[PDB]
């Protein structure tokens, strides 16, 4: 795997370090990128069959272990479902109302 | 020199209309602007420094020569000043009382 | 001739539909327009109408029924678009 | 059909796995993409439906469940799309 990984998440292109993808053991991205059985698009980028807009916040959680959302963000619930898919339990917990 | 289909940027909102629509009302501002140098945005679209959301209703008056507004529209006054700026006296009249 | 997939620019908004959808209602305006035309800088067929409301005109051509978003504030404006496109049954559905 | 399918839905572009499109047998997308089609100028497969609502159709194909944005005003329109694509369980979830 290259140091800088080029991803196509549901049509949206993201670039991140390989270390960011395997930063959280037993998560889905760690299972996928742990060192040619991975799906690729017509341009050779690694393909993730998930919502491309919400991946931005998934990626920022992998980088910082915390994520700041835009003001009045209407997709907190949808992002929680993405966090469940990527198997990020701490992110799932952060997006769950306490009360 | 003007294309049949004119690309406009008004208050950051993009509109496309026929050149004939823009020059449909003689002596109005859009007629003066587009009837034989004009400000352009970074993408070369003709720029109008007015409210982008309101231009929708100015454009539809140029197309239909009637005013069909959204249900419970609270901005007749603000729209009247857009009509005054674009020099559309018949639209101003339809909006006023 | 006209392609199977027609690319439209309606007042700034880009829509793609089948040619069969545009000519589905005889004697309507889109039927007159696309029966076997102004184009934008990218070669798309241009319709000089409100681009946001065309979404609902297009769904009516697909199903002959249109579901609107909850608390839709432009029912009257959509009725005017339906009159322009000469879709009398859609005009009727939008009249209370 | 390629492993990664590029779609144009009424003007809106989507990418998904071919397996996601044929995941529900006897549904419309399964009938369309079964190995045994209209294309846009860029060669993408064309579906003549509302492009904005397809996002939620696609998430249902992925998870067999769909979470909607807060105060989503197009539940009724999405239900109609689910009926068109012949996804009865999704139609049930939206009633």
């Amino acid at each position: 795997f290259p140091e800088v990984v080029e991803l196509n998440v549901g049509g949206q292109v993201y670039f991140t370090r390989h270390s960011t993808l395997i930063s959280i053991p037993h998560s889905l991205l760690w299972k996928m990128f742990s060192p040619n059985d991975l799906a690729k698009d017509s341009k050779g980028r690694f393909f993730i069959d998930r919502d491309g807009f919400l991946f931005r916040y998934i990626l920022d959680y992998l980088r910082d272990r915390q994520v700041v959302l835009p003001d009045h963000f209407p997709e907190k619930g949808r992002l929680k479902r993405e966090a469940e898919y990527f198997q990020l339990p701490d992110l799932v917990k952060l997006l769950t109302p306490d009360e | 020199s003007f294309p049949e289909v004119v690309e406009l940027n008004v208050g950051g909102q993009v509109y496309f209309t026929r050149h004939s629509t823009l020059i449909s009302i003689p002596h109005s501002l859009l007629w003066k602007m587009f009837s034989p140098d004009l400000a352009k945005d970074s993408k070369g679209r003709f720029f109008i420094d007015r409210d982008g959301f309101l231009f929708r209703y100015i454009l539809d008056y140029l197309r239909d020569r009637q005013v069909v507004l959204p249900d419970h529209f609270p901005e007749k006054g603000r729209l009247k000043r857009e009509a005054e700026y674009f020099q559309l006296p018949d639209l101003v009249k339809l909006l006023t009382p | 001739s006209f392609p199977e997939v027609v690319e439209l620019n309606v007042g700034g908004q880009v829509y793609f539909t089948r040619h069969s959808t545009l000519i589905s209602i005889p004697h309507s305006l889109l039927w007159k327009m696309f029966s076997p035309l102004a184009k934008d800088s990218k070669g798309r067929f241009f319709i000089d109408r409100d681009g946001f409301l065309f979404r609902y005109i297009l769904d009516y051509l697909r199903d002959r029924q249109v579901v609107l978003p909850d608390h839709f504030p432009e029912k009257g404006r959509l009725k005017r678009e339906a009159e322009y496109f000469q879709l009398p049954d859609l005009v009727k559905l939008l009249t209370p | 059909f390629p492993e990664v399918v590029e779609l144009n839905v009424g003007g809106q572009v989507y990418f998904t796995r071919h397996s996601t499109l044929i995941s529900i047998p006897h549904s419309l997308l399964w009938k369309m993409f079964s190995p045994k089609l209209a294309k846009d100028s860029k060669g993408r497969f064309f579906i003549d439906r509302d492009g904005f609502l397809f996002r939620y159709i696609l998430d249902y194909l992925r998870d067999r469940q769909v979470v909607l944005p807060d105060h989503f005003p197009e539940k009724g329109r999405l239900k109609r799309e689910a009926e068109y694509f012949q996804l009865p369980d999704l139609v049930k979830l939206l009633t």
Binding site: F53 | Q13 | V14, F52, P69 | G11, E74
Partner: peptide, 15 residues
């Protein structure tokens, strides 16, 4: 690019 009608709450990518 203002949030008018469905643009206000429906994110999408044009073709």
């Amino acid at each position: 690019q203002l949030p008018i009608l469905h643009h206000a709450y429906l994110p999408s990518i044009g073709g």
